[PDB]
Design a protein around this ligand. Structure first.
Ligand code: HEM
Ligand code: HEM
Ligand code: HEM
Ligand code: HEM
Lengths: 146, 141, 141, 146
């Protein structure tokens, strides 16, 4: 992913304000609610029967923390997303067989969650920079399919 | 296919747009053009600059079309037949572009309507915009 | 969204299918499992061997469901409501898999009915299967 | 793309029966009929207003021949598709901005045309081998997006 220094600055500044404990769970939870077939990959996570159950599910919150951590790792090394995500790509593609459109969906759900949290601060240029990031992350996760 | 709860959620959420229709529609277009520059190809002679009055005017048309879709949500192909002919027959818009604008409409609603944009309403809005997109990308005359 | 002519094409083509409906459903499933092995994960306990009586039995169910859909092409959400609940709510089938099975059905039809599989009929059948897929991947109770 | 010896033999045997003057135009023509937004990329080709007009359009047939030639070349370079298709990828992605789902659609329309022409010869194992090939070609065309 090629971000301008200005775009990288905008992205990094906003991410510094993202709640490490909650935002990943909010994004994963909304993925499960908005695109319900994704729940099939999370049988062991317990109660996903209603939107409230999903968003309150402790395992969803905990797993979401890991997801956010991976986006964070992506941001730390935008010039090597493929290498950063190689083990995760093997898992999601070779082991789990997640269809890669779902990687795009989760990235865009995260973008919606950032807009929800930050309101007017999530300007169109800030969004555009984030879209480069989540597209790069989705591509890196899908690398074993390519 | 929308559930009864989906229709309830959409009518309630979109109903809060009101006189901000032009503003929100324009912001969603600007987000799309900036984030996904390939979409600009469909507007070769538009002023697509930030704050453009032309995008503001177009934003109102899009938003008003969504209002029309809500008021006809059980019979949308007949209500949007003119828009389907425009987008599918005349302009031949690739379906992917509707996913991009739909996403940008969701981002816009999330940024302006924090209390309304719950996970359930988010889900319903996404299905609604996907249904509108299917109609506008279909040829059914 | 299907045009009136699409509906006529689909009815005419599926009618020509007639008594082979079941055989073709079985073949389409076999084609899907072989071409797109990830789809087998939805049938973990099935005998998926070539000639499987279980796959043949299931192919007949799929074909009969399509025949029902063709018969209710104007009212597919109501006609397919149980099947939607099964695939979208219970089984949680990823929508990509419906594109894969739809393709394998078209391949099966093309292989057996080449005279009937004109470009116009191909187009209408593709739209019909996409419409069925949208219903079966929607939760709308 | 790796084919078993059995798959390679079967793919080659079927391809030898393909009419190279017609099948590409049939595949391209059916793409334009079944997925009509794809016509936007071929505005200069003249009359595309009815299925008959599309299928009998001389420019569709001529262009289809070039497309088929690219698939034929790919069959001889299955281990180096990203290399072989690099120039075409730059054209379709960077210059034309064709959304890559359309590459998948054309490959599957080609498969439908092979089924139409060869019927009982286009067995499920033969189809599975061809799906590997057209997925490989679509992926290589989309490389600039990855
Ligand atoms: C697109 C961005 C994504 C990122 C950054 C991401 C990140 C992660 C991480 C960090 C893990 C934990 C790996 C480990 O502990 O070894 C994980 C596991 C997993 N992911 Fe994702 N993921 C993404 C998309 C998805 C999607 C879309 C799905 C399904 C629809 C999915 C399904 C799973 C599953 C099932 C697991 C294992 C859960 C378990 O331990 O039972 N992932 N992911
Ligand atoms: C929710 C989805 C959409 C809605 C509700 C919508 C609605 C509208 C409306 C109301 C108009 C004006 C119609 C008129 O002037 O009579 C219009 C025009 C147009 N739309 Fe959309 N649209 C949508 C998606 C898209 C997308 C995704 C694209 C392309 C990226 C697009 C490209 C265009 C173009 C090129 C025009 C004509 C502009 C001109 O030259 O005057 N539309 N749309
Ligand atoms: C045209 C699209 C489809 C049609 C018409 C269809 C129709 C049917 C029918 C009639 C049944 C039997 C229901 C019953 O008698 O209880 C069934 C079951 C099932 N379908 Fe589908 N289906 C479609 C697509 C798919 C796809 C794409 C998948 C996954 C790749 C899938 C996975 C399943 C599974 C797992 C079952 C239950 C099998 C069992 O364990 O007994 N279906 N479907
Ligand atoms: C997926 C397999 C595809 C293959 C193998 C393929 C192959 C080719 C080839 C060989 C050319 C000629 C390049 C040249 O003259 O230098 C070409 C040009 C072109 N392709 Fe494709 N293509 C594919 C998919 C698509 C799709 C899905 C579209 C969507 C519309 C598309 C749009 C075009 C256009 C617009 C041109 C230039 C036509 C002109 O000269 O005016 N291609 N392609």
């Amino acid at each position: 992913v090629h971000l301008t220094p200005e775009e990288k600055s905008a992205v990094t500044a906003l991410w510094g304000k993202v709640n490490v404990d909650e935002v990943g769970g909010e994004a994963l939870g909304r993925l499960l609610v908005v695109y319900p077939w994704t729940q099939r990959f999370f049988e062991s996570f317990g109660d996903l029967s209603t939107p409230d159950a999903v968003m309150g599910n402790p395992k969803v919150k905990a797993h979401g923390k890991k997801v956010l951590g991976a986006f964070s790792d992506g941001l730390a090394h935008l010039d090597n997303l493929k290498g950063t995500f190689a083990t995760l790509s093997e898992l999601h593609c070779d082991k789990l067989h997640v269809d890669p459109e779902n990687f795009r969906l989760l990235g865009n759900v995260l973008v919606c969650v950032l807009a929800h949290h930050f309101g007017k601060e999530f300007t169109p240029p800030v969004q555009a920079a984030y879209q480069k990031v989540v597209a790069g992350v989705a591509n890196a996760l899908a690398h074993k399919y390519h | 296919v929308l559930s009864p709860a989906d229709k309830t959620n959409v009518k309630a959420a979109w109903g809060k747009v009101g006189a901000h229709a032009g503003e929100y529609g324009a912001e969603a277009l600007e987000r799309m053009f900036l984030s996904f520059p390939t979409t600009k190809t469909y507007f070769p002679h538009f002023d697509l600059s930030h704050g453009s009055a032309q995008v503001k005017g177009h934003g109102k048309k899009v938003a008003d079309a969504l209002t029309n879709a809500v008021a006809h949500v059980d019979d949308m192909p007949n209500a949007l037949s003119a828009l389907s002919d425009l987008h599918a027959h005349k302009l031949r818009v690739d379906p992917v572009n509707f996913k991009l604008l739909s996403h940008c409409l969701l981002v816009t609603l999330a940024a302006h309507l924090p209390a309304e944009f719950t996970p359930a309403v988010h889900a319903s809005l996404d299905k609604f915009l996907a249904s509108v997109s299917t109609v506008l990308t279909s040829k059914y005359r």
